[PDB]
């Protein structure tokens, strides 16, 4: 759950948005932003 807000701040910046997708993978919701991985 917390990684979701982590993604929120990071992708609000965007640098670690890839790390945010990796967190969503760690979060068991890798689909969350799986598209936002944007290849």
From Swiss-Prot:
Protein name stated in the entry: Intraflagellar transport protein 140 homolog
TPR repeat positions: 14-39
Organism domain of life: Eukaryota
Gene: IFT140
Pathological condition linked to this protein in its record: Short-rib thoracic dysplasia 9 with or without polydactyly: A form of short-rib thoracic dysplasia, a group of autosomal recessive ciliopathies that are characterized by a constricted thoracic cage, short ribs, shortened tubular bones, and a 'trident' appearance of the acetabular roof. Polydactyly is variably present. Non-skeletal involvement can include cleft lip/palate as well as anomalies of major organs such as the brain, eye, heart, kidneys, liver, pancreas, intestines, and genitalia. Retinitis pigmentosa 80: A retinal dystrophy belonging to the group of pigmentary retinopathies. Retinitis pigmentosa is characterized by retinal pigment deposits visible on fundus examination and primary loss of rod photoreceptor cells followed by secondary loss of cone photoreceptors. Patients typically have night vision blindness and loss of midperipheral visual field. As their condition progresses, they lose their far peripheral visual field and eventually central vision as well. RP80 inheritance is autosomal recessive.
Quaternary structure note: Component of the IFT complex A (IFT-A). IFT-A complex is divided into a core subcomplex composed of IFT122:IFT140:WDR19 which is associated with TULP3 and a peripheral subcomplex composed of IFT43:WDR35:TTC21B. Interacts (via C-terminal region) with IFT122 (via C-terminal region). Interacts with TTC25. Interacts with TTC21A.
Included range, full protein: 1065 to 1103 of 1462
Species of origin: Homo sapiens
Function noted in UniProt: Component of the IFT complex A (IFT-A), a complex required for retrograde ciliary transport and entry into cilia of G protein-coupled receptors (GPCRs). Plays a pivotal role in proper development and function of ciliated cells through its role in ciliogenesis and/or cilium maintenance. Required for the development and maintenance of the outer segments of rod and cone photoreceptor cells. Plays a role in maintenance and the delivery of opsin to the outer segment of photoreceptor cells.
Localization: Cytoplasm, Cytoskeleton, Cilium basal body; Cytoplasm, Cytoskeleton, Microtubule organizing center, Centrosome; Cell projection, Cilium
């Amino acid at each position: 759950e917390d990684m979701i807000e982590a993604a929120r701040y990071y992708e609000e910046k965007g640098v670690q948005m890839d790390r945010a997708v990796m967190l969503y993978h760690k979060a068991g919701h890798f689909s969350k932003a799986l598209e936002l991985a944007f290849a």
